[PDB]
Scaffold this motif. Structure first.
Motif, PDB file in Angstrom:
ATOM      1  N   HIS A   1      48.967  36.994   3.625  1.00  0.00           N
ATOM      2  CA  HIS A   1      49.971  37.359   4.620  1.00  0.00           C
ATOM      3  C   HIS A   1      49.297  37.785   5.963  1.00  0.00           C
TER       4      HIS A   1
ATOM      5  N   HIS B   1      49.093  35.842   9.824  1.00  0.00           N
ATOM      6  CA  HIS B   1      49.351  36.454  11.132  1.00  0.00           C
ATOM      7  C   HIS B   1      48.203  36.080  12.099  1.00  0.00           C
TER       8      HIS B   1
ATOM      9  N   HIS C   1      56.957  35.603  11.673  1.00  0.00           N
ATOM     10  CA  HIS C   1      56.944  34.728  10.497  1.00  0.00           C
ATOM     11  C   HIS C   1      57.708  33.443  10.775  1.00  0.00           C
TER      12      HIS C   1
ATOM     13  N   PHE D   1      54.592  29.618   8.859  1.00  0.00           N
ATOM     14  CA  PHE D   1      54.022  30.802   8.218  1.00  0.00           C
ATOM     15  C   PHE D   1      54.578  30.935   6.788  1.00  0.00           C
TER      16      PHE D   1
END
Ligand code: NI
Length: 109
Positions: free
Chosen positions: A69, A73, A80, A84
């Protein structure tokens, strides 16, 4: 103290699967108390911070999820965006089960 071998391995593997090997020498993990957050990333310092207060509660898949996660980024930016969430689902088809174990563990003892 969380075994560094496990963290080094998950970090290396996730960087490889997210096609970020070109940034491998710059990306590192730091473990420190964080307030109201599980993890964060310094996009300038290429450092992933993991909350020292929650790290002993996490499974290896949960650590892999958190690291994936934060690296997404680094790859895509602040929000998001579609790309993503699709990459995150590609790495974790069981995304929903990881998050329920993650929430239950944040509830602590
Ligand atoms: Ni996020």
């Amino acid at each position: 103290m969380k075994d560094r071998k496990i963290l080094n391995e998950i970090l290396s593997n996730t960087i490889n699967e997210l096609n970020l090997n070109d940034k491998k020498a710059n990306i590192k993990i730091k473990i420190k108390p964080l307030k109201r957050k599980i993890a964060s990333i310094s996009l300038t310092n290429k450092t992933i911070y993991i909350n020292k207060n929650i790290l002993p509660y996490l499974s290896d898949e949960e650590i892999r999820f958190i690291l994936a996660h934060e690296l997404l980024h680094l790859k895509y930016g602040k929000y998001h965006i579609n790309e993503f969430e699709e990459e995150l689902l590609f790495l974790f088809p069981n995304k929903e089960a990881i998050l329920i174990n993650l929430i239950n563990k944040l509830h602590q003892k």
